[PDB]
Structure formats: structure tokens, C-alpha cells
Amino acid sequence: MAQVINTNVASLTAQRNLGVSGNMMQTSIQRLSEMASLTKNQILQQAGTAMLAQANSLPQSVLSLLGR
Amino acid sequence: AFQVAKSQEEEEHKERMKMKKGFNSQMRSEAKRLKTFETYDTFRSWTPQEMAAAGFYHTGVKLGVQCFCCSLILFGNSLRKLPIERHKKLREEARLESFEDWPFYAHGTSPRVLSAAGFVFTGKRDTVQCFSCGGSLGNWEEGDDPWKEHAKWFPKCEFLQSKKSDSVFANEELRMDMFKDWPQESPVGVEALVRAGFFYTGKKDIVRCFSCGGCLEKWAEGDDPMEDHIKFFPECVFLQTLKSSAEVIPTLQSQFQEARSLSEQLRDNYTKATFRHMNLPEVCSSLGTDHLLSCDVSIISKHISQPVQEALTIPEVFSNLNSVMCVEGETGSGKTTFLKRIAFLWASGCCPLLYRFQLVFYLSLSSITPDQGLANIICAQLLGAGGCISEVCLSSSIQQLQHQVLFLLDDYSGLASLPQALHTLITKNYLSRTCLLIAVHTNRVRDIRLYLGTSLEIQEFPFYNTVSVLRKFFSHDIICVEKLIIYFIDNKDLQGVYKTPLFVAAVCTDWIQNASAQDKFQDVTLFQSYMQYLSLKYKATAEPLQATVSSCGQLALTGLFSSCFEFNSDDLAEAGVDEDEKLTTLLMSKFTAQRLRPVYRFLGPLFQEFLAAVRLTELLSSDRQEDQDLGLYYLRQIDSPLKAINSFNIFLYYVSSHSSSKAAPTVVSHLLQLVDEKESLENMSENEDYMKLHPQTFLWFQFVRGLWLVSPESSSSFVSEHLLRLALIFAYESNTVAECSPFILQFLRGKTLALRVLNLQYFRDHPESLLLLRSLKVSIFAQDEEIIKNYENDISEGYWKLSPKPCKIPKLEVQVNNTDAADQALLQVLMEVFSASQSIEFRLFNSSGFLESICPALELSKASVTKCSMSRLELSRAEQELLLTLPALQSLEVSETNQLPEQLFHNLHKFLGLKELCVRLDGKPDVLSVLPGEFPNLHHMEKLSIRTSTESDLSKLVKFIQNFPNLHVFHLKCDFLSNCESLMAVLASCKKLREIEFSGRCFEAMTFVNILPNFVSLKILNLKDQQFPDKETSEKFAQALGSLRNLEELLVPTGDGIHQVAKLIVRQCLQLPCLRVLTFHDILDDDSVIEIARAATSGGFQKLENLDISMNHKITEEGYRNFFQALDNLPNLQELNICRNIPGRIQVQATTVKALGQCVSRLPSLIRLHMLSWLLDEEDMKVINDVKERHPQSKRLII
């Protein structure tokens, strides 16, 4: 009943889609056998999954930190 | 939202199938509880003490408790659900000392019916609280039905309903016959307890020996049968005939009417009820104590020969008592609270060793040095010390009953050898076999250390103590408590500033006496109020109290100067003298054990930065001789903008208090002093300390490095967002809004801004001046989502609440992605901002569900649209009729679909203004029919980029493309043209051919050696794979390119034009300035890179930054020579590809390649080297790693 929650877990649904960007890292390790695209996606989107990884367990820290 | 309920099924059901086992006859022991409710993980916000007294039990794993009445596991202890209350919703002396202080006023209601209804009196004016309620109140009227008042004052107390609703057996067969009534809760071996010489009595776990009479306590589930009776009854005669004095030695290594009546008088006096009073509610003065109404801290028990021994608790102090002991903490705070805790709770007697301690002695020696013993201070600050009993006879009453005498000595740090019996008692501590305590700070532990066995340290646990105090004392306001706990994980170093639990009274006055924190709860208000308490506490004039503030402020300048935290005690030129003022002030202290020169320590390392903020406003709004040259001096030692976000966020947000504004234009001038730089990256990344979001700060460097990795203007756009944001907070809170406004207009211009207005009250001061920004940007990649996280650490709300009637709003920017819906509310926001702005920039990125969004968007909008990007649409007719019917279009880029627009094309040939196209992957021989409808319209065209699949009609193209007066960049590629004569006519009949992209069209380049001499001011030329021999194109393009010294970007393809073309062409491009990009793909065999080697030795090259040697025939030690000089002597280059020779190119002499990595590390200004198409190993990974870390100016090595 804090109501900083609903679009923040549609946002966490998008953060699980950054988990699907973790599956895009699995696609990049799947796709081994010019590459500046893979450079910016792996490094930049890895930094974005880090930001939304601490900021994805951080709303898990909200739910494991708010009294319910 | 729901993920705590589904995850509640996940871990609560995963734990429900795991640890159901509960021995509900075992978990009642206190020592195992406060032992194992101490040293567990402790990361929650909940007190383990009264959760060990809640009715549940727990081991030390992640919080899963169980019970005996409602047997269920419960964990995840979070806000506001008190587990004693959650126990309910998930299912002699105190009364005596109460009415002792009974006043004269309250007698309309009798005190004895208050005695017969459960009331506790707290020793103030007529105020009561129950033993388990916590609310002391007065408000006594007539007819106060007392228990019904208790159900009628406040509904907080659920103790309301929780409480309302042998002589013939003197042989071991008869003793054992009494032992056959054995209690179930004891799994200890019963037969050895029979043979221990006892017999049972009839209650819980006491037991009665027959020889001496041993019965006593400490009976639990894993004890020893003999041990307690030996080491606590060493004179049992049957045990004396069982184990004599040489046999009690292992247990020894395991663990008068004036004197007696004196003990009765002092025992009657040391249970003082008014002794409870503390100034922890100083001016707040809340009706409550500090034990039943306040939580506790723990013990860092440290051994004298440096192991950190344990972290004991307060009953664990009582278990193995110390005959002489020192604790460190804060005077006024916890240490004297620990001593008065011992005496006042020694007036209670609940612990199973209490009531049998004999004579405690509370003493604070900071006031006195009175060269006289017991009668001086017991007759001085207390009632009296007896006259019939002499002062030495009182000391004889000490030295006749020594074994249970407990001392509460305070502050030897303000004591010398002047008191006689005191200091000779301390220096001869054997001569009284007593327990001595003392509470000296960490400046003078060394004088006590000669007389110590172990050291004790008081330490706050700010996981749960701050929310217990702010919970219990501020249940009046709990939404800002929600702000506190949500702030605990937005700012995970909140424990890094809460470092003393009984100087949180400044926070208490900053809730009840300063209500401004209820709407302004961030950190600097809080410890600004703590600093304001440090001005209020010890209220004095401009002494070195104040120069201790400023002088330890420049100790903090030395603190963040060279990032030194635990000091050297060499440079006391900052503060220096009268250490009693600095430790009494308590802004610092020193080291305990040996160092060579001892080491200063702080109460809080990040709190020191707030001291440097006090130093900064002291060096910002004061005497302008050299003081603000010192604040200007260190304020110019921090001059890198990528460090500015994090370091200027924390530290300059500490500066965002103290609003004085006498040189706030100088520090926001330092915010404007930050210009386009690159070395700021490792200027931040080299530093050590990062304050509050510390691994997150490492991540901030990773993401901002990711921002510069892709887009230079989006990286600097985020830099503009944080600089204009923190400069906006500092500007509005500094109130320099008309003092610095045109300088802020210098701080605005040129920067492209994405639309963020929710700090609108900081910004709306004068938006018309604050409106001449370069660009405005909205998008819907992960950058804006991270910015949602950044304020989370709307548009028309702050934007129209900003301005009721906006004026002359500048141009706009749109990006959309493929995951976009068509919600009409944000389309109304688009209606407002399109009604406001000049015109729109507009980018379509794979956006499906936008047809149903572009119909109401253009329906709400009028005919003012400039830029539309058509990235991979559906290409339906109606929305491009609706886009079609709006005039004044200026920009349309079309490069994606194989499906070709027809009505949008031939009807796009009607209007005026259009300057952008594109025709990639379409195919048109005959679509050009209403293009001569455009041919009367527009001599205004600035982007032409055509692709066909085959030959079109070229007479119209040579006609009106000949009729262009305003030429520009061109992209032309890829069809069966076979006409160099029409293109020779149109390129020969024009004027401004200075950015030509002719990447790979089927074409004969005989034209280019004729039309390239016609125009000399060309700057950018791109060509993909063509025919290129070594005498025709090399000599004729050696002349034609030879007379073309104005070029900047060169892309030459794919010929057997061989090293004579490197002689003349590498000669002339070597000898022309203003050149940046250079590319030799599919060419340059090793003698041509001899030409770039000997050419690249002499120079004339210093403008160049970008260069590509992709597709050699073979790179080897030859390439080590050629890329040795050519990758040596040219300190501006940044681009290199060596790649796509894909199968086996480890013929490179890899260790000489490591020497080539030394050679690339000679180059200062490089960024991206691409070392593809060969194997590395572990070794050259370590080599290019270590020599990459020599100068870190480069970041892009790509394998």
C-alpha cells in the first residue's frame, strides 16, 4: 500500500526485459562461430543491465524493505 | 507490487518446506538468545532484543522465526509491523518505585486503584505509563475510569487484551525417586543429575542439594551436571568428599551492624527513582526513560594483544565480569548511559545474577580532582557517606566485602594523581579484589592500559537503532519514516553517517522542533541540523571552539586534499593546540596502540566532507584576503567535469546548504569553467574514495564511459543534465537568481537539452531568458529509463505548472522505438508541446502501433513539422496522406523499405521547404514521372541520397540536378548506371561539389579526373569498390587528387593501383593540412605501407586523427617496421583497423607485436585500435593490458 509500486513493476517488467538483454548477452555468446555494434551493445547495454541490475534488485530491496 | 506476494510464496514456501522443526520446550533460555541474536548478519531495520522477547525465536539465518502458540516461520522483517504486535495479528519493584514519587495533585482519582489496575509512575508531574505500553501521560480529570482510560487514551497498548483477555528423602533411591518427576524440557542426562547430590523440589529448574543446600540457577539444555555445583558451590561437604580442593582446580580454570546496615542504607539509596533523568530529550523533554523507551548498542570486546575478541552484549558483560575495565564511546552519550543503565536497572533485578550484586559506585571525574576520597564526592554530589563510619572505615567496608563491589568510574582523561585513595586504589587494583569500570575516551586509553585485561568499545548498529528511536519517539509522523527507510536503500551508506546513537537528539529536534525536514528529507538538512546542534551544544563565542570548527574544517581540507583519512599527526598546522577542545568538541581523536607516529581517527569519514563544506562556506563568504584563495585553490584543484557528477554531487551537495551567496557565482563559475574535456574520465577514475553510492559510483563511471562510447553529444547531454541540475538546485537554493542570471545564460547556450522539468520551482524564475537552449529532446535507448531511475533515486505538469502561457518555445526532438503504444494522454502532452514549440524534429524507429498514434498526433497538430525519419515503417497509405497534406515540411529521410512509397513520393513533389530524402533499397526506372512537378518548386535542397536497382531516366536528373544552386553532401550508390556522360554533364555543370559520397556505383571513373580538377574546395570524399589500375588511375588520379589539398575525409577503394599511387598520393595527402579521416581498404601491400612509413616519419600529418589500414595482404615484422614509424611519430591519430584477413594470420611474430603494442602506447591521442584476425594469448593480454594502463587516454582496444 505504498503506491510507488505499480508502474515501477511495469518498470521492473522492463527490467526483466533487461534480463532478456541478459539473454541478448547469451545471444552474443551464442553468435561466435564492423563489430562496433557488438562493442556498444555488450559494453553499453552491459552497463545498462548493471544500472538496472542494482536497480532491479533495488526494487526487490524495496519489496524486501517495505513492510508487507 | 505483486512480486512481494509471489516472492512471498517463493521464499516463504521454500522455507516452509525447509525448517518446520521446533523444540518448543527448548527455546526459552536468555543467554543463547542474546548470544545468537547478536552475532548474526543483522541487515534489517528491527531490534533483536524485544524480538528475542517477542514470543518467537530465530537462529541467525535470514530472519525466519517460529513460535509455540502459532507455529509458523516468519521472515522478511520490514517497516512498521512491530513483531510483538505481529505476534498477535499473525496468530514487585517497579510498581513499588512508581507510587514512591506520588505528588499531591492527582487525588480526584485514588492512587491505590491505580495500583490495582496496572500503572507505572515515571517520577514527573502526575504522568503514567503501563509496563508494556510506552505512553506516559497526564491530563487527569474527574471521573477517569483508569483501566477504561487505558482502553480510551490511545489504542496502542495491546497488553490490555494480551493480559486481560524432602526430609525423609535423604538417600539416592528416594532422591532419585524424587528425580522420577523429571521435567521434559531438560535433555541433560538425568542419572548424572541424580548422582550430582541434589534432589528435586517442585518448580521449574531449581534443585536442592542435601549436604550444603545447592539449588541455584543456570540450568539449560546443553549444560554439565557437576560443573555449576562445583564452581559455584565449592564448599559442599558431600562434594568435598567427592572432589576436593585439588579437583576443583579444573573448574577454577573453567570459571558488623555498621557494615551490614551501611549496605542496607546504601542499598536503599542506590535505588533512586529520580536517578533516571537524562537530557537526551533535552528541549523536547518527552515523558519517557531511555531503557524502556529507547534501544541499545553492543560491545566490541577487544583483547589487549590485538585480536578483536568478540562482540558481546549487555548480559554478556555480566557473565564474565572484569575486575578492572575500560570502555570507549561518547561522554554524555552511551558510556554514562551505560553506567546509569547499570545502576538504574540494578534497581530492578531481572537478570538471574541480579539482586546479589552488592555495591555499585557511579562516578564522573570530569568535574573534580578533589584530593580527598569517598566522603568528599559521596557527600558532595550524592546524599552522604556516613559519619559514625569513617571515610577510611567506609573504605574498610569496601576492603572487607570486596568480592561483589562494582565500580562505575568515568573520565580518567580529566584526572591526574591528585585524589589520594582513588588514584592509589587504581594503581594498586589488587588490594581491592573488586570489579572496577571506567569510561575514558580513545585519546587516553594508554594510561588505563597498564591496568586492563580487555578493552570494550561502544558502537552503534544503525541498521535498527535509528529506526527504533525515530519509530518510538516519532510515531506521530511515520510517512517521513517511510522516507527514511526508502532512503536507506536509495542511499545504502546511511549507516556510514549514523555513528553515534545518542547524538540523534539533533534529529529529534529536527522533527519535533524543526518541521522543515518533513518536506525536505535528504541528508544535508539532517546533519546540517546536527552541526547546528554542535553550535547550540557548548554555546560560546568565537573561541577556538569556533576555530576548532574552522581548523578541523581545514583538517577536512587536508582530508579531501590528498584523499587522506586516517591522518599522520604531522601537519597540525591546521588545528594544533588544546586537544581537550577538539576531543571535547569531538571532531577527531587518535590511535590507541603503538604506531611510529600515532594516527588520528574520525567519528565519520564522510561526515568529514561535511566539515569541509563548513570550511568551504567559511572559505566562500568571509574575508577575501587569501581565505577565499584557499577555497578557490582547492576549488580549482577539482576541475574535471566527469568527476563533477559524482564528487561534486556528494561534496557540492554538502555545499548546497549554507546559503550565503557571497562567492556562489565563483563556484557556479567553476561549474561553467568545466568545458569539453576527455581526461576528466580518468581524473575521476584514478581517485580512491567514493562516498555514498560507492560501487554504484564505479557503475556511474562505467555508464558515462558507455555514453561517450556511442554518442559524444548524448554523453555531454547527460553532463549538461547533471551540471544544469545541480547548478540549478545550488542556484535557486543559493538565491543568486538575479545576481548570476546572464552568466547562467552563458551556462545554457549551445547545450542540447532533453526535456526534464519536475524541479520546476528551481527553474521557473525566468524561463524566457532560460529558454534559448540549442535543442530539446524526448525519446521513448535505456538512457531515459536510467534518468527515470535518476529522479527516482510529469512533463506538462512541471511544464505548464512552470508557465501558464509559454512564449517562443524552441525546436523539438523525437525518437520512438518498436515497443510503443498509442496512449492518448501523452499525445495530449504532445499537443501541448507542439502548440508551444517552434517546429518538430521527429524520428521513427520501427514503431508499430504508431499509425493509430500518428492519426491523433497530426489530428491535434497543425502544419508545422520539419523533420521526419522513416526508419522501417509499415508503409500504409492513409498516414502518409496525413503526413502528405501538411505543408512546410523540411526534412524526410527514407532509406529502409523495399516497398516503395508512390503517393507520398509524387505528391511529395508538390510542396516547398523539403531538403532531406533517401532512396536506399527501392528500385526505380520509371517512378520519376511527377518529379518534374517538383522541378518548378524547390531550389532549396540539402540532402540527396539515391539508390535504384537499375537505370532510371537521366535527362530530368541532369536537367534539374544541374539546376541546383545550393549543393551539399551527397550519397549515391549501386546501380547499373553505365552513363558517365550525363553524370559528367551534371557534375561538370555545377559549383559546390564539396561532400561527395559515391560509394560503389557501377561507373567508369574517367569523369572524375575531369570534374575533380573543376572543383578544388572539396572536403569529404567516399568511394567503394571500383576499377583502379596503377598507371591510368594512379597517374590521372595522382594529378586530380594531387591538386585537392582542401580535403578532410578520404575513403579510397579496392584497386591493383600499386605503390606508385602511394608515392604520389601518400605524398600529396601527406603534404596537405586540414585532414582528419583516411582509409585505404583492399589496398596497401607492404611497400605502400613503407610509403606510409617513410612518409609518416617526417610529419606534415599532425592534423590527422582517423585512419584505416584494413585488408593488407600480410602484416608481419614488416608491419612492425612500417607501423613502428607510422604508428610512432604522429601524436594526433586515433583510428586503426587491422582485420578481415580471417583464417590464420598468426604469422605476425607475436612478441614483436607486443613491441608494436609498446609502439602504439607511444601514441598519446589514440582511442580505437582494432587488432582483429589473429590469436592472442595470456601474455599479450597482460602486455596490452599493462601498457594500456600507462596512459589511460585510450579505451578502445578491440580483439
From Swiss-Prot, chain B:
Where's the NACHT domain? 323-618
Tell me the subunit arrangement: Component of the NLRC4 inflammasome, at least composed of NLRC4, caspase-1 (CASP1) and some NAIP protein. Flagellin binding by NAIP5 triggers assembly of the inflammasome, a huge complex that contains a single NAIP5 chain and multiple copies of NLRC4. (Microbial infection) Interacts with S.typhimurium (Salmonella) flagellin.
Instruction: From the UniProt record, report the name of the gene that encodes this protein.
Output: Naip5
Q: Where does ATP bind?
A: G332, S333, G334, K335, T336, T337
* Matches recorded under SUPFAM superfamilies: Inhibitor of apoptosis (IAP) repeat, P-loop containing nucleoside triphosphate hydrolases, RNI-like
Q: Which domain of life is it from?
A: Eukaryota
Kindly provide the name given to this protein in its UniProt entry: Baculoviral IAP repeat-containing protein 1e
Q: Which PROSITE patterns match?
A: BIR_REPEAT_1 (PS01282), BIR_REPEAT_2 (PS50143), NACHT (PS50837)
Provide the Gene Ontology terms for cellular component.
IPAF inflammasome complex
Q: In its UniProt record, which GO terms are filed under biological process?
A: apoptotic process; defense response to bacterium; defense response to Gram-negative bacterium; detection of bacterium; inflammatory response; innate immune response; negative regulation of apoptotic process; positive regulation of interleukin-1 beta production
The outcome of changing G706K is:
Nearly abolishes interaction with flagellin
Residues engaged in binding Zn(2+): C209, C212, H229, C236
Expression (tissue specificity):
Detected in macrophages (at protein level).
Kindly list the residue ranges recorded as spanning the membrane.
none
